[PDB]
């Protein structure tokens, strides 16, 4: 019988950017980058081979998520609204929900492939995922009533691979976007900031 095997690699970078003095009105910048390195299994889903021994083909699709929030509260209670600035080449997807972004970029599919692989890595499992996808540059609006001073945001937030190696050509798989948005957040922008005021 046909089967499909289903993997999500998270990636676990902590990264920070600094906003510098803004006054109320602005709308300051950060970049999000992908950064090559170690993954963990945070999920799957397999009913196939749990590997392949280099002498027999399979067939793989791979998908990059990003799944960010579009509003963060600050330590002092207060909602900070998050803006795409630019994203590049990612598909902004599923956009009618309003607690997160989802960024897909589909890079590989239909890939006939022969060599030795474990196609259903469980979770907790490690890889190196040596892919570089294009950056997100977000703007932050923020509330008026903002007190000022010194701001320091951790904006925890999902990036991964999603790899799906299949016993067959064309076959095709996304993560639900609920499923994606429920992944652990492994990631962390630190956002610095003073606010100055209006
Ligand atoms: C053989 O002919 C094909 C025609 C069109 C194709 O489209 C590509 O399909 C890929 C399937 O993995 C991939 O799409 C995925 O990723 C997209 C975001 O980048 C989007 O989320 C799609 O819904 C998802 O299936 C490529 O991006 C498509 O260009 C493939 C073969």
Redesign the pocket.
């Known amino acids: 019988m046909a089967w499909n095997n289903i993997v999500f690699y998270s990636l676990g970078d902590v990264n920070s950017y600094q906003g510098g003095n803004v006054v109320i009105t602005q709308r300051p910048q950060f970049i999000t980058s992908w950064r090559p390195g170690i993954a963990t299994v945070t999920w799957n889903q397999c009913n196939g081979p749990e590997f392949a021994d280099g002498s027999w083909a399979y067939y793989r699709?791979?998908?990059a998520w990003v799944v960010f929030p579009k509003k963060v509260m600050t330590k002092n209670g207060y909602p900070l609204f998050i803006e795409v600035h630019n994203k590049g080449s990612?598909?902004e997807?599923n956009t009618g929900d309003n607690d997160s972004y989802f960024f897909?970029?589909?890079?590989?599919?239909?890939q006939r492939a022969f060599d030795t692989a474990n196609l259903c890595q469980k979770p907790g499992e490690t890889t190196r995922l040596t892919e570089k996808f294009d950056d997100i540059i977000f703007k932050v609006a923020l509330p008026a009533d903002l007190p000022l001073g010194d701001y320091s945001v951790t904006i925890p937030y999902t990036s991964g691979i999603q790899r799906?190696f299949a016993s067959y050509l064309?076959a095709?798989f996304?993560i639900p976007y609920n499923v994606a948005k429920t992944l652990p957040r492994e990631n962390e922008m630190l956002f610095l900031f003073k606010n100055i005021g209006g």
Do not use: Q
């Not at 897909?104 to 239909?110: A, S």
């Open positions: 699709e791979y998908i990612w598909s997807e897909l970029k589909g890079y590989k599919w239909d799906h064309g095709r996304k």
